[PDB]
């Protein structure tokens, strides 16, 4: 009957959900996501932070069950595009399973999943679930009794939390772990954020789950990755305590890549009942930073930092280029294509290094012929802006870029060269456009700061559909200049129209005698400029 | 048909969360607080900030009501410390409220209270409540698509969080009212926290919401203060629209405390049915920048600040002192009791200034023997502290001080200076506490700076609970030096106890037996130098 109290074995019952291709949606064991993946289009995450974690969980897995590809010869006989036929190894893995079925139960008495089992603070205080749970806030902070849905999860959604936590988790003040050596009087003072949480995070999608997983599933082999031979995830290794490992094992360390999609920067253990889950304790677990990781993280774009060179006292220092939720994610195809980024030069990044191995991967099996130029790919960006001082979430990060492969191929003269000049010619524009907010903003007397960051926005924002998809329109047969033209022609209406709206919002206010039918003339003169200025940035356009 | 008019009038419908005496919370109506607050301890408000914004709309009531304490003197016709006779003036209020029904009730088809009932995006969206609640964020920010209880919200609840939301809410890009003229299509760009999210606010607590009430009442003759003869609440003024009040009124305003404890600093408009309210429209309302605006907020402690001078080419700039988070309130004292802050000098803030008019008044009330000095207060610290770019909340402070009012009195070299430097004491102490666990993690070679920060937290973490019951000692029968010495006394104790803990834990780890003398050597030395300097430190200890 305490049979039932462990009853909770992630390989068997249902608690990821998941989207079948016919609308459909269902949460799912391990086992059959592994089966059913063809016929999913994708994970639906209680949150996109955890949709890019449990992929990482299921990479992980995937990676072990076969010993991963170490050629891309070897990747290549899992992976066919014929609809009717793609499955996977679901042998290789069921087996995999088997083995390892106690590891995998979450509510196993001493080796529960991704879970201290022994871990209380001093006075076994029990927390609640805003501490796992991301828009949750800590209830502490807003003093609040008020329930949020949050005093009780589902032991699925739990589970869910539970791996999302241990990617992605804020570097506040913890509660200490007894029998943490860091533990300083019951609390853990902050040791950075968990590891996903350093990543600008990039994986690639297809239509399917299947091709999501198999396309993320990069060769040990691949150009600057590192794989040791006794890379295993975490519930391949030694059952964590409170104290992280010691620093002569982490001096190995990650592994690779079992080890790091598994990386157990937390340690957690559930309260919990028949039923329910009511409770935790969250304390640190094992620091992992990011500096000069490029060599073992694919799903980052990297970029390098002087500052921290200066004060580490290291020749070369690079760091995961995380994602700004100002931005949509085009407007770093610079970065994600080719490894360009606008600082480049200045710092001495190569852009050999700065565009994610995950893409390289990508761009290796088309160079190889495993996949067709004209083959479509969704990239993903996801990541967490964290707030004040690393300790709160502000907000998440997910977007994404469609695109075709060839640009990953052609990041140099070809079509992926068309596609970057292609943003530095919006980028270009909106900032014609901010020039005339600016210009206006005198003409009525007024500080430019806001105007000009607004028509900024207003810019990017009329910009972004149509650019998205003339990127789309990007294959094998097409032209440089007949694109790179189409494009000009696009921006150059959506945004002297704009433009047009601005100067028409001036002349509404510049009545409401002498500094009045100022702005009128004043504001006409800034347009002509614009227009002038626009036809000058823009000059493919003419028509 | 009347059914065609729903309705919830804030003066009559339960809708105010309170606490009696006798543990019992129920919700009230607006009438029936201000009919028992002498029976009530407190407002239990959703989250603190609630309490400090609600307070002050019972405030602006009250004041309003009876034409606003003019003396000390009318105001003192309006209290005893007689539990037992202790009623508010609830007939020159009941006639107050009765007049302006029409403005408090929530859901009326053009007058609704707070609010603007014509409000609308271009497209007319309806966003969620995320935006009023101060516990939950934005749906949007995380792409969450499962409800943390905001689909919904009461009326009452709703009508809560619609007032905070005009005292205390987070300066983002905000949705664009139709007829802003600030509304560069359909977003309004950041403009500034809600007026109370600019304040390290200060509120004066008693036994009773009746106290509590009465205390916080200020003269409007007290010195240092605006109230403009205009002074009325949002409700005593023209509706207000999508548009700000435009700049040749905003030009001398706020009015007062009626005007100001009632500002419109958002423009916002529930949505509901029948039941309960669904959704919202919040978008930006009053700016009120907070720049020497001393003389009209008594609820804050002041602060000069010379970068603003030099930016706004200004010889002159006070603004609000912020809570700190991290520490405790009665680490701020210094402001509190005599507006004494450690830049002080440097800024050349006048002390007068920096202390909030709130306290001015007490001792003011204090000196011409209206409260007797022995008198308590709970002197409450309420903040929100605003997260990135303003545009996000990290946490809510709400601290207090429990005193005599003597502290305010005696500020010169009487009491209140003991209290001063016992607290300046207690400082001192904890940095050689710091210096200890720092000059042992040296003594090791660890790095020094986490221990030495964690040995501080600690440090104020052990002095907190003693010093707060030392300062409650401080009555106008006692001793300045007798007490002062006490405390030092004390905090000897207390931190060398916990020096003793350090230089144990330092040795935790090989008095299980697990693991040069250098270490051992060194570390007996900084144990000796830390209890050597801490007898410095605190010379009245033995």
Redesign the interface.
Known sequence: MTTDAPSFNLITQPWLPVQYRDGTEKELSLLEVFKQAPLLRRLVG???TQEFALLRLLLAILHDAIGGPEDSDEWAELWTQDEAEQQLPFDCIASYLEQYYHRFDLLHPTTPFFQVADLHTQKNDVFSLDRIV????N?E????M?????DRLSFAEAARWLVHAHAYDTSGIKSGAVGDPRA??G?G?PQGVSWAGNLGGILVEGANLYETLLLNLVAFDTDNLIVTPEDRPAWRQPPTTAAPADDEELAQRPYGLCDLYTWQSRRIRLHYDADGVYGVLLAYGDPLAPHNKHNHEPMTAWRRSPAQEKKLKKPQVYLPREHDPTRSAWRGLGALVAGEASGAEQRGEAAAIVRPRILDWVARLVNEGFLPEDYFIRTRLIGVSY??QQA?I???V?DHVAMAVVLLHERDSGLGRTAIKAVEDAEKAVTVLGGLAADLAKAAGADPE??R???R??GFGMLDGPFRTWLATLAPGTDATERRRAWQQKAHRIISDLGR?LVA?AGE?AW?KGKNTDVWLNASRADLKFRAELKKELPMATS
Request: a negative charge; aromatic letters at 8%.
């Open positions: 209680d949150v996109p991301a828009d949750v806030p209830g902070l807003f003093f609040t008020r329930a949020r849905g949050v300083k009087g609390k003072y707030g004040t709160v502000d907000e998440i997910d806001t105007p960051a607004a028509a926005d207003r709206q919002e206010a409401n």
